[PDB]
C-alpha cells in the first residue's frame, strides 16, 4: 500500500497536532504515544488512541499520495511548534517520515502499527449542546472532583441526562459542585446517567472546539452507556473517553432545602481579601464572622502571626461564625463566573451553599434555584 505524501498549511497542521497531543499519554506501551496521520480523499486526518481516550481531527491538505503512517506524538508536536510560517511538506520514505518547511528538514522514524489499537466507533449521538457552556460547565465542576485513585467514585464527573438538560456533578467528600445545562436530545425523552473520569473530560474541554455546539454520543434509550464510552463530536473533530465503572454518591440529599442565614458579596473583593488574610494560615483555616452589614475575615495563630480584615456584606438572618479551608473556598468562588456570590448557611458545622448571585428579610430562607451550586463543608472553629 502507497506512501503518504502531502502538503499542509503550518498553522492548521500545528494546531491539529497540538490538539491531539494534549490527549496522548506521557507510557507502559511506547507506541501508544504515537500519532496516526492518514491521507484520504477529503484531506488529512490526525489521531491518537491509547485504549482509553481517542482524539481525531480532520484538516485541509493537498494529498499528493494517499496512505497512513504512525509517528512519535511528542516529537511531531515539538517539531510543528517550531516550524517557520511556511508550507509543510510531509513525505513517507521507507522507515522514515520526511518533513520539510522552509530551509528546515526533519526525519522521524515510523512506528510499527501491529500493536497500535484502532480508533473505536462513537456510540449513537444522544444530543446537541453549546460547546462553550459545556466546556465551562466541566471546568466548573471538575474543581470539586477527587484526585486520588484510592477512591474511584470520587475521581469522576457524573453526567445525568434528561430530555431537557444535562446535569454535571463532582465531589471529593469536602465539596460538591453541580451544574445544569440546557441541551436538545436527538430522540426526545431520556433518563440516564454515566460516570466519566474528571481529569480526561476536563482535558477534552480545555483543548477546545472550533464550532458553536457539540454532540454528545452516549447511545439512546435503554442502550445509553452500553458501549462503555462517551463520545464528543464537533466540526472536524471527534473524541472518545472510556466511562468510569463506579457508583457516584447520592448527592441531592446534601443540598439544603432552606437556610437560617444568607449573605451576598462581590466575588473579586472577597477573593482578594481571603488571599490576603490566609497568608498567615499555617497549612489551615480562615474564619468568617457574619454580622449585619459586615464580614470579618480572620486567620492565623500567636506562634506564626494573625491577620484580619473587614468587608461590607449584604447579610440577613442568624449571625454566625464559620470556618473553611481557604483553598476550597477560593476554588468555589473562582468557579462561579459571576460578579457576586450568595452564601447559604445553616450552622457552623453544616455545609455552606455557594451560588451565583441574582438580582434580606428575617428567615428561614428557601434555597434559590440556580444552574450552578458549589457546596462546601466547613471546618470546626478552635
Amino acid at each position: 500500500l502507497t506512501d503518504l505524501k502531502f502538503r499542509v498549511v503550518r498553522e492548521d497542521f500545528a494546531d491539529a497536532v497540538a490538539w491531539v497531543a494534549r490527549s496522548l499519554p506521557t507510557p507502559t506501551i511506547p507506541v501508544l504515544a504515537g500519532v496516526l496521520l492518514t491521507g484520504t480523499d477529503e484531506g488529512l486526518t490526525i489521531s491518537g488512541f491509547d485504549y482509553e481516550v481517542s482524539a481525531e481531527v480532520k484538516v485541509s491538505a493537498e494529498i499528493a499520495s494517499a496512505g497512513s503512517v504512525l509517528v512519535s506524538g511528542r516529537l511531531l508536536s515539538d517539531i510543528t511548534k517550531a516550524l517557520p510560517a511556511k508550507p509543510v511538506e510531509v513525505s513517507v520514505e521507507g522507515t522514515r517520515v520526511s518533513l520539510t518547511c522552509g530551509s528546515a528538514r526533519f526525519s522521524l522514524p515510523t512506528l510499527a502499527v501491529e500493536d497500535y489499537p484502532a480508533l473505536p466507533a462513537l456510540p449513537e449521538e444522544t444530543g446537541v449542546i453549546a460547546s462553550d457552556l459545556f466546556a465551562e460547565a466541566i471546568g466548573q465542576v471538575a474543581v470539586a472532583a477527587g484526585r486520588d485513585d484510592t477512591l474511584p467514585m470520587l475521581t469522576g464527573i457524573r453526567v445525568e441526562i434528561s430530555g431537557e438538560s444535562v446535569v454535571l456533578a463532582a465531589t471529593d467528600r469536602f465539596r460538591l459542585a453541580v451544574r445544569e445545562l440546557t441541551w436538545v436530545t436527538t430522540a426526545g425523552d431520556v433518563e440516564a446517567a454515566v460516570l466519566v473520569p474528571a481529569k480526561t473530560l476536563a482535558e477534552a474541554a480545555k483543548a477546545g472546539t472550533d464550532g458553536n455546539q457539540v454532540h454528545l454520543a452516549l447511545g439512546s434509550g435503554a442502550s445509553v452507556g452500553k458501549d462503555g464510552l462517551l463520545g464528543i463530536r464537533s466540526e472536524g473533530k471527534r473524541s472518545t473517553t472510556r466511562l468510569l465503572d463506579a457508583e457516584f454518591p447520592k448527592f441531592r440529599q446534601l443540598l439544603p432545602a432552606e437556610h437560617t442565614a444568607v449573605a451576598t458579596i462581590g466575588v473579586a473583593e472577597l477573593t482578594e481579601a481571603i488571599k490576603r488574610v490566609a497568608l498567615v494560615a499555617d497549612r489551615a483555616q480562615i474564619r468568617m464572622e457574619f454580622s449585619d452589614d459586615t464580614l470579618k475575615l480572620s486567620a492565623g495563630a500567636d506562634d506564626v502571626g494573625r491577620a484580619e480584615e473587614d468587608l461590607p456584606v449584604d447579610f440577613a438572618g442568624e449571625p454566625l461564625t464559620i470556618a473553611f479551608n481557604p483553598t476550597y473556598l477560593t476554588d468555589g468562588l473562582g468557579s462561579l463566573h459571576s460578579e457576586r456570590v450568595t452564601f447559604g448557611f445553616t450552622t457552623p458545622s453544616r455545609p455552606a451553599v455557594l451560588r451565583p448571585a441574582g438580582e434580606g428579610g428575617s428567615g428561614p430562607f428557601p434555597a434559590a434555584k440556580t444552574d450552578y451550586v458549589y457546596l462546601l463543608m466547613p471546618v470546626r472553629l478552635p
Partner: peptide, 10 residues
C-alpha cells in the same frame, strides 16, 4: 474536618 454527610463515605 468533618466530611459532607455522604451516606456512606462521609
Amino acid at each position: 474536618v468533618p466530611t459532607l454527610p455522604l451516606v456512606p463515605x462521609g
